[PDB]
Amino acid sequence: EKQDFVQHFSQIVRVLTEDEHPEIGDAIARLKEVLEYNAIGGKYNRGLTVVVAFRELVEPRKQDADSLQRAWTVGWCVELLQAFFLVADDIMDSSLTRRGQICWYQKPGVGLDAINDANLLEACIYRLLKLYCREQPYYLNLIELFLQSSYQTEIGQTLDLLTAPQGNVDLVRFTEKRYKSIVKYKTAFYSFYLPIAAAMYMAGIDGEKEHANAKKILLEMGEFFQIQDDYLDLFGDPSVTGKIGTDIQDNKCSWLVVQCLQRATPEQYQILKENYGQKEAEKVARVKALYEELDLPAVFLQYEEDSYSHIMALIEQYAAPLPPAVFLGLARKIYKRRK
Amino acid sequence: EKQDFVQHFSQIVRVLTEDEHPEIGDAIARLKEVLEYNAIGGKYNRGLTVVVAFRELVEPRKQDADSLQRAWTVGWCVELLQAFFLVADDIMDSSLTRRGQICWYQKPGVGLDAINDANLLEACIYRLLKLYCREQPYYLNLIELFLQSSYQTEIGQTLDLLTAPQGNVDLVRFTEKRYKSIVKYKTAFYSFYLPIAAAMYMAGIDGEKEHANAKKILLEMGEFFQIQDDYLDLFGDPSVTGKIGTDIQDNKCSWLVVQCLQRATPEQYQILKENYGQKEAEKVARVKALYEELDLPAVFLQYEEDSYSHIMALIEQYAAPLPPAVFLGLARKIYKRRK
Ligand SMILES: O=P(O)(O)C(O)(Cn1ccnc1)P(=O)(O)O
Ligand SMILES: O=P(O)(O)C(O)(Cn1ccnc1)P(=O)(O)O
Ligand SMILES: C=C(C)CCOP(=O)(O)OP(=O)(O)O
Ligand SMILES: C=C(C)CCOP(=O)(O)OP(=O)(O)O
Ligand SMILES: [Mg+2]
Ligand SMILES: [Mg+2]
Ligand SMILES: [Mg+2]
Ligand SMILES: [Mg+2]
Ligand SMILES: [Mg+2]
Ligand SMILES: [Mg+2]
């Protein structure tokens, strides 16, 4: 599956490049370079979800070459939405590596020009949708869906950054209630809801109950995925995950610190206060010792088992009339992941 | 005109704020703050152009309250597109002030979080269009128009930044041919074409000849406007323009350097080579002395007279069947501007 999906990328590149106006040639070469560094190297769960789900929702005799091509292309549109966000995210989080190579903005010669690079990747979504789905009854649905997903994710990031000021203590806002909102908005909508929802619209499924039902399962699945992400920031292998963690030094409202705070003694509270949110490596080292000392890896492994069971109960409840396989495929893909 | 337009801004703010989900309250407060700092303080030529042109194209008996409200709102959508771009632009150009206050990203407490702030402003466009024009026959036209304008402007910025590497000499690419492309894409489409084109679509004017004709006049008018902008970077009053210039130190392909290069002796060429594109204040001072020594202020004042006459000749040719007043209003607004 992955190999077929991933191999469509050069057609994606070729169409967006074929826009040679030989005056903008140099900016089009620059965009090619940006697509290849930034869109390649991840898992492709989002883009493959668009494709798998489409096949599962459309009768095979209606899966002609042109409509499967549209499915691949909308999958790559979710991959570009992702790239757009990660490139910007890496800048704002002072990150070092992404997908096992240095973050694009750290490339000598690139710098904060990557800000325009990220906006350019976002624009490619709508060019792709124009070029392949313009004459489709779902065209506007997809456009409004991508735009709403972008907005939601920018709201969430806004709350991610607010709650994590450089230079200021902020343990008072690290609550479960707060964590849930941030992750709903910054991750769950675009990573889980958007890809399945894209495929539904392409299969002709636009009912509000049907979309709201898919949303019940998929938002929960997004919360879970971000929680895993927060655990891997501190406790994952950067050669495996492809990325160096920064949450503690960026003062972030990570699942870990939330859980630390509800378990911590007043003296433990103080350790976190003196040590969290700062670049000093020995202060980070202390926070991690507090985490390991409170058995948060075990706390997480139990949360991961329970959350998973609740997700499977939501599928039993809300999957119909869609095949459970649609959601089971994704769930089983992200469960117990170390990457 | 301006006062009525500018006074609609709190309804704009109130609708985008009314999205209180009291969980995202803090990100919505943050967005309000971002609208006020970044959308206010300029000339409003773009947003007022949407409004003036709409009134001039729609029979008065059809200018009801709801449709004028839609016109104001689409005008503010062009103002937000502008804000989005300037905030990002100021970061990538290492600028200090904007509209007579420090650039948003230089505000203590803000920093590169302004990258998400800019994306959030862009998203507001599409929320506004959804909220006010969803049930209008021009809705998709406006959406595709805003998205295409964004893409064009990102292509141009891409070429602006490429041609202006930090650390590297690049006088060999500072050609008229190159300058024209960069400014077509980075300025002319969104600042001139987009606002009039928005108003046409809202008046029911979607013919391709009619849009292409408006484009002939308006792109030329955009080139002219960027040329003025480049002159004011070096030769304008920062208390008037509201912004400190950075072109020479950012190594930019400004109208001035292009014109310098076609007039320069080989020894003058060398002065520019040793001095252009660097932060050192005495090197910038030398470049400006080379400019004044070649009479480029006078070269510009003559270009400004000639270009203007050619623009007025294009209006005579291509304005019909639209009123010439539509384009004359804009032209006369930007001509001989010191701000
Ligand atoms: O931890 P984050 O929220 O920043 C992250 O997961 C990215 N992201 C961005 C939006 N939602 C998630 P990453 O760890 O890749 O840096
Ligand atoms: O000179 P620039 O192109 O950067 C500028 O005009 C902004 N801009 C951005 C896109 N087109 C123009 P500003 O002088 O405001 O910094
Ligand atoms: C939302 C989060 C946690 C950001 C990373 O998403 P992935 O972990 O799916 O990253 P890639 O496969 O796209 O590299
Ligand atoms: C395209 C350019 C030259 C950037 C600034 O546009 P304006 O000079 O119209 O700035 P504001 O009135 O929006 O402040
Ligand atoms: Mg982040
Ligand atoms: Mg991050
Ligand atoms: Mg993370
Ligand atoms: Mg610039
Ligand atoms: Mg600039
Ligand atoms: Mg300028």
Enclosing domain of residue B24: 1-339
Chain B residue numbers with beta carbons less than 8 Å from the beta carbon of A161 are 113, 116
Q: Among B89, B155, B324, B17, which Cα is nearest to A31's? A: B155
**What 3-state DSSP class applies to B101?**
strand
Q: Among A278, A279, A261, which Cα is nearest to A270's? A: A261
Q: Taking CB atoms and an 8 Å limit, are A155 and B120 in contact across chains?
A: yes
Q: Are strands B97-98 and A97-98 parallel, antiparallel or unpaired?
A: unpaired
3-state SS, chain A, equals: CHHHHHHCHHHHHHHHHCCCCCCCHHHHHHHHHHHHHHCCCCCCHHHHHHHHHHHHHCCHHHCCHHHHHHHHHHHHHHHHHHHHHHHHHHHHCCCCEECCEECHHHCCCCHHHHHHHHHHHHHHHHHHHHHHHCCCCCHHHHHHHHHHHHHHHHHHHHHHHHCCCCCCCCHHHCCHHHHHHHHHHHHHHHHHHHHHHHHHHHCCCCCHHHHHHHHHHHHHHHHHHHHHHHHHHHHCCHHHHCCCCCCCCCCCCCHHHHHHHHHCCHHHHHHHHHHCCCCCHHHHHHHHHHHHHCCHHHHHHHHHHHHHHHHHHHHHHHCCCCCHHHHHHHHHHHCCCCC
B252 marked as binding residue: yes
* CA distances, B310 to each of B99, B220, B222, B229, B306 (Å): 30, 9, 13, 19, 6
b/e per residue A170-181 (b: at least 16 CB within 10 A):
bbebbeeebbbb
How far apart CA A195 and CA A142 sit, in angstroms, is: 10
Ligand 4 pocket member B43 (CB < 6 A): yes
Query: What amino acid is encoded at B262 in this protein?
Result: Q
* CA distances, A84 to each of A41, A90, A219, B92 (Å): 14, 10, 21, 17
How far apart CA B28 and CA B36 sit, in angstroms, is: 13
Nearest ligand to the CA atom of A182: 1
**Residue A339 alpha carbon, nearest atom of ligand 3:** 8
Using CB atoms within 10 A of its CB, is residue B181 exposed (0-12), middle (13-18) or buried (19+)? buried
The residues facing A98 across adjacent strands are A101
Contact B338, B240 (CB under 8 A): yes
Q: How many Cα atoms within 13 Å fall on the side-chain side of residue A333? A: 18
**Element (DSSP H or E) covering residue B216:** helix B208-235
| Beta-carbon contacts of residue B272 (< 8 Å; ≥ 6 apart) | B171, B257, B260, B261, B264, B287, B290
Active-site residue, B295 included? no
- Identify the DSSP state of B100: T
How far apart CA A170 and CA A253 sit, in angstroms, is: 9
Q: Among B98, B48, B211, B80, which Cα is nearest to B146's? A: B80
Q: Taking CB atoms and an 8 Å limit, are A123 and B151 in contact across chains?
A: yes
b/e per residue B293-323 (b: at least 16 CB within 10 A):
ebebeebbeebbeebbeebbebbeebbeebe
Residues in chain A: 339
- Selecting from B31, B92, B154 the residue whose C-beta is nearest the C-beta of A123 gives B154
**Element (DSSP H or E) covering residue B38:** helix B25-38
State in Å: Cα A93 to ligand 1 middle.
Answer: 9
Q: Among B88, B77, B95, which Cα is nearest to B241's? A: B95
What are φ and ψ of residue A101, in 5° steps?
A: -150, 160
3-state SS, A240-298, equals: HHCCCCCCCCCCCCCHHHHHHHHHCCHHHHHHHHHHCCCCCHHHHHHHHHHHHHCCHHH
* End-to-end Cα, chain B, rounded Å: 19
Q: Taking CB atoms and an 8 Å limit, are A147 and B156 in contact across chains?
A: no
How far apart CA A53 and CA A198 sit, in angstroms, is: 9
Q: Are strands A97-98 and A101-102 parallel, antiparallel or unpaired?
A: antiparallel
Place of tokens 């002065």: B271
How far apart CA A335 and CA B115 sit, in angstroms, is: 32
Resolution of the experimentally solved model in angstroms? 2.3
Nearest CA in chain A to B86: A116
A42: left (phi over 0), alpha (psi -120 to 50) or beta: beta
Interface contact B136, partner A, CB < 8 A: no
Contact B104, B38 (CB under 8 A): yes
Active-site residue, B237 included? no
Number of domains composing chain B: 1
What are φ and ψ of residue B102, in 5° steps?
A: -70, 145
Task: Give the number of A-B residue pairs with CB atoms closer than 8 Å.
Answer: 113
Q: Taking CB atoms and an 8 Å limit, are A161 and B120 in contact across chains?
A: no
Contact A205, A57 (CB under 8 A): yes
How far apart CA B6 and CA B57 sit, in angstroms, is: 21
| Token pair recorded at residue B8 | 């609609």
| Token pair recorded at residue B59 | 């029979």
Break-preceding residues in chain A (C–N over 2.5 Å): 20
* CA distances, B178 to each of A67, A87, A249, B172, B185 (Å): 40, 28, 44, 10, 11
Angle at which helices A65-92 and A114-133 pack, to 10 degrees? 160
* Closest approach of A147 to chain B, Cα-based (Å): 7
- Identify the DSSP state of B250: T
A306 marked as binding residue: no
| Beta-carbon contacts of residue A104 (< 8 Å; ≥ 6 apart) | A34, A37, A38, A87, A90, A98, A110, A114, A117
**What 3-state DSSP class applies to B98?**
strand
Q: How many Cα atoms within 13 Å fall on the side-chain side of residue A165? A: 11
| Beta-carbon contacts of residue A149 (< 8 Å; ≥ 6 apart) | A81, A189, A190, A193, A194
| Token pair recorded at residue B334 | 């930007």
State in Å: Cα A293 to ligand 1 middle.
Answer: 26
How far apart CA A212 and CA A223 sit, in angstroms, is: 17
How far apart CA B134 and CA B127 sit, in angstroms, is: 10
Q: Taking CB atoms and an 8 Å limit, are A119 and B119 in contact across chains?
A: yes
* Closest approach of B333 to chain A, Cα-based (Å): 30
How far apart CA B339 and CA B332 sit, in angstroms, is: 14
What are φ and ψ of residue A242, in 5° steps?
A: 80, 15
| Token pair recorded at residue A132 | 């392949």
Interface contact B137, partner A, CB < 8 A: no
Using CB atoms within 10 A of its CB, is residue A215 exposed (0-12), middle (13-18) or buried (19+)? middle
| CATH at A309 | 1.10.600.10
Q: How far is CA A147 from the centre of its chain?
A: 15
**Atom 11 (ligand 3): residue with closest C-alpha?**
A42
**Element (DSSP H or E) covering residue B159:** helix B139-162
Place of tokens 């650039």: B103
How far apart CA B313 and CA B323 sit, in angstroms, is: 14
How far apart CA A241 and CA A180 sit, in angstroms, is: 23
Residue to probe by mutation, ligand 4, list B183, B191, B192, B334, most atoms within 8 Å of CB: B191
- Selecting from B91, B113, B159 the residue whose C-beta is nearest the C-beta of A161 gives B113
Query: What amino acid is encoded at B110 in this protein?
Result: V
Find the Cα–Cα–Cα–Cα dihedral A38, A39, A41, A46, rounded to 10°. 140
Q: Among B209, B216, B158, which Cα is nearest to B182's? A: B158
Active-site residue, B84 included? yes
Q: Are strands A101-102 and B101-102 parallel, antiparallel or unpaired?
A: unpaired
Interface contact B131, partner A, CB < 8 A: no
How far apart CA A185 and CA A178 sit, in angstroms, is: 11
Contact A61, A91 (CB under 8 A): no
Chain B residue numbers with beta carbons less than 8 Å from the beta carbon of A31 are 158
Residues 101-120, chain A, touching B (beta carbon < 8 A): 109, 111-113, 115-120
* CA distances, A331 to each of A209, A325, A337, B172 (Å): 22, 10, 11, 55
- Selecting from A30, A112, A154 the residue whose C-beta is nearest the C-beta of B120 gives A154
**Residue B183 alpha carbon, nearest atom of ligand 2:** 11
| Token pair recorded at residue B229 | 């902008």
How far apart CA B265 and CA A298 sit, in angstroms, is: 74
Break-preceding residues in chain B (C–N over 2.5 Å): 20
What are φ and ψ of residue A95, in 5° steps?
A: -80, 165
Q: Among B195, B177, B243, B232, which Cα is nearest to B81's? A: B195
Candidates B19, B20, B24: best to mutate against A (most CBs of A within 10 A) is B24
Q: Computed over its alpha carbons, how large is the radius of gyration of chain B?
A: 21
* CA distances, A153 to each of A310, B18, B31, B120 (Å): 24, 18, 14, 9
- DSSP codes of every residue in B264-333: --HHHHHHHHHHTT---HHHHHHHHHHHHHTTHHHHHHHHHHHHHHHHHHHHHHH-TTS-HHHHHHHHHH
How far apart CA B76 and CA B326 sit, in angstroms, is: 19
* End-to-end Cα, chain A, rounded Å: 19
Interface contact B326, partner A, CB < 8 A: no
Residues of A that are catalytic = 43, 84, 89, 93, 98, 160, 186, 225, 229-230
Q: Are strands B97-98 and A101-102 parallel, antiparallel or unpaired?
A: unpaired
Whether residue B321 is preceded by a cis peptide bond, meaning omega within 30 degrees of 0, is yes
| Token pair recorded at residue B249 | 């130190």
Residue to probe by mutation, ligand 1, list A93, A228, A233, A244, most atoms within 8 Å of CB: A93
How far apart CA A161 and CA B177 sit, in angstroms, is: 43
Interface contact A15, partner B, CB < 8 A: no
B233 marked as binding residue: no
How far apart CA B84 and CA B78 sit, in angstroms, is: 10
Query: What amino acid is encoded at B285 in this protein?
Result: A
* Closest approach of B64 to chain A, Cα-based (Å): 27
Ligand 2 pocket member B46 (CB < 6 A): no
* CA distances, A179 to each of A186, A218, A268, A273 (Å): 11, 17, 21, 18
b/e per residue B19-42 (b: at least 16 CB within 10 A):
eeeebbebbbebbeebbebbbeeb
Nearest ligand to the CA atom of A243: 1
How far apart CA A190 and CA B248 sit, in angstroms, is: 41
How far apart CA A114 and CA A95 sit, in angstroms, is: 14
